[PDB]
Amino acid sequence: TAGQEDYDRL
Amino acid sequence: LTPKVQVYSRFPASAGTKNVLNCFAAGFHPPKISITLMKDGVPMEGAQYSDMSFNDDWTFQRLVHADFTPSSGSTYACKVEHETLKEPQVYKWDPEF
Amino acid sequence: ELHTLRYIRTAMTDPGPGLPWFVDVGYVDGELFMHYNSTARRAVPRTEWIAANTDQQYWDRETQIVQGSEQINRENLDILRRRYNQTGGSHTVQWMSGCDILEDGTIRGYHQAAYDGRDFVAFDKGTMTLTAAVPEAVPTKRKWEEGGYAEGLKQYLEETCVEWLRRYVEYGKAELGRRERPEVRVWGKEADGILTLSCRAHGFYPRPIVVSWLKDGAVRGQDAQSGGIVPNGDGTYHTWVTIDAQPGDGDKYQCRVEHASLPQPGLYSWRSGGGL
């Protein structure tokens, strides 16, 4: 149960 | 970050009975690894490569398994090729150990 | 009562031959439930308790957000490469995501990242800031405080992560609660005046196991060398514990296996022999 793929942004 | 390999069977070894041969390697980097199961020095058919996963200390782990039938006189082993190893590590499987 | 969820993500440069570059694997209390591949581009269920309790629109929503991470981590593989002034070779981007439900009922959310097997950035919930480990992780922190990332993650880890984890325990109550009995076999070998005794346990669930050797009904801790709890292809586990002894002293040595499936610890000998 994952969310915003934006939190992977480095 | 040198790979630690361990060769083992799913069910207790029996002659003329279906069994799954497993080769587990953990604690290695880079994640690129060549794990192959072999019968008498020749690779085995039906290898299941699944899957790229890391531990809490960012160290990778991989499980390779294939369905086989143990036979007397034939030797079963696992070959692991890595850039850190230099020489390929071979772990022999024993039905009575 | 301790429940855990982990989202393992790996972005690779050298997979290498005929292997995927991006993989996303999900876990519930150690057991695998979801899997993603770079060539397949679809998030699929592994166990039966998750597939029978979820809709197809749920999995279509999950694969859409995971393929979004695939493109984002592909950029990070190039952005970080220029930060360290590298051309390309063997570089990997690792991602840790999920939350823990303690026995008392305390939330424990975590969001960690790593580059080339070394920690890059970790999220702090008690400070509401992103912790930088390497001086190259400073521009990452700057991007996070420029927009909205810290507020959204707290609303996700403390609520969204926990709300669904509570449902997974209810869905897989029969699967995770089930206990499997291992098949114990006691072996031996002779080399150069040393009688090496082996103890192998085949297919047990759950993962925690206590395997120890006993000489004359006494625990010999120091002496026995263990291989570790290694997993099988069908989800179950295996362990290998070995000890060195004198030749002609095999019968006085016995393997003790402590498991959740057994009401009392099982004592196994070579001549007994093993099971049952």
Numbering used by the authors:
A (entry chain C): 1 to 10
B (entry chain B): 2 to 98
C (entry chain A): 1 to 276
Paper text:
Highly polymorphic class I molecules encoded by the major histocompatibility complex (MHC) are crucial in the adaptive immune response to viruses and some intracellular bacteria, binding peptides inside the cell and presenting them on the cell surface to CD8 T lymphocytes. In contrast, chicken TAP genes are highly polymorphic, with each haplotype encoding a TAP molecule with a peptide-translocation specificity matching the peptide-binding specificity of the dominantly expressed class I molecule encoded by the BF2 gene, with the BF1 gene expressed poorly or not at all. In this paper, we find that two other haplotypes known to confer resistance to Marek's disease also have low cell surface expression and promiscuous peptide motifs, and examine the structural basis for promiscuous binding in three low expressing molecules. Second, we show that peptide-binding repertoire and level of cell surface expression are inversely correlated in both chickens and humans, indicating that this relationship is a fundamental property of class I molecules.
Crystal structures, based on heavy chain and β2-microglobulin (β2m) expressed in bacteria and refolded with synthetic peptides, showed that BF2*2101 remodels the binding site to accommodate two peptides with completely different sequences, including the anchor residues. Small residues bordering the groove lead to a large cavity in the middle of the groove, within which Asp24 and Arg9 can move, creating different configurations, as illustrated for the 11mer peptide GHAEEYGAETL and the 10mer peptide REVDEQLLSV. In BF2*2101, small residues like Gly68(human position 69), Ser69(70), Ser97(99), and Gly152(155) create a big cavity in the centre of the binding groove, allowing Asp24 and Arg9 to move. However, the two structures with the 10mers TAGQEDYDRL and TAGQSNYDRL display a completely different mode of binding, for which the P2 Ala does not interact with the MHC molecule at all (and therefore is not an anchor residue), with Arg9 interacting as a bridge between Asp24 and Pc-2 Asp. A further mode of binding is shown by the 10mer YELDEKFDRL, for which both anchor residues at positions P2 and Pc-2 are acidic. In this structure, the P2 Glu interacts with both Asp24 and Arg9, and Pc-2 Asp interacts with Arg9. These various modes of binding are presumably just a few out of many and illustrate the promiscuous binding of BF2*2101, unlike anything seen for mammalian class I molecules. In this article, we confirm and extend the finding that BF2*2101 binds 10mer and 11mer peptides with three anchor positions, with many different amino acids with different chemical characteristics, mostly charged and polar at positions P2 and Pc-2 (and hydrophobic at Pc), which is unlike any mammalian molecule described thus far. The structural analysis of BF2*2101 showed that this low expressing class I molecule achieves promiscuous binding by remodelling the peptide binding site in a way never described for a mammalian class I molecule.
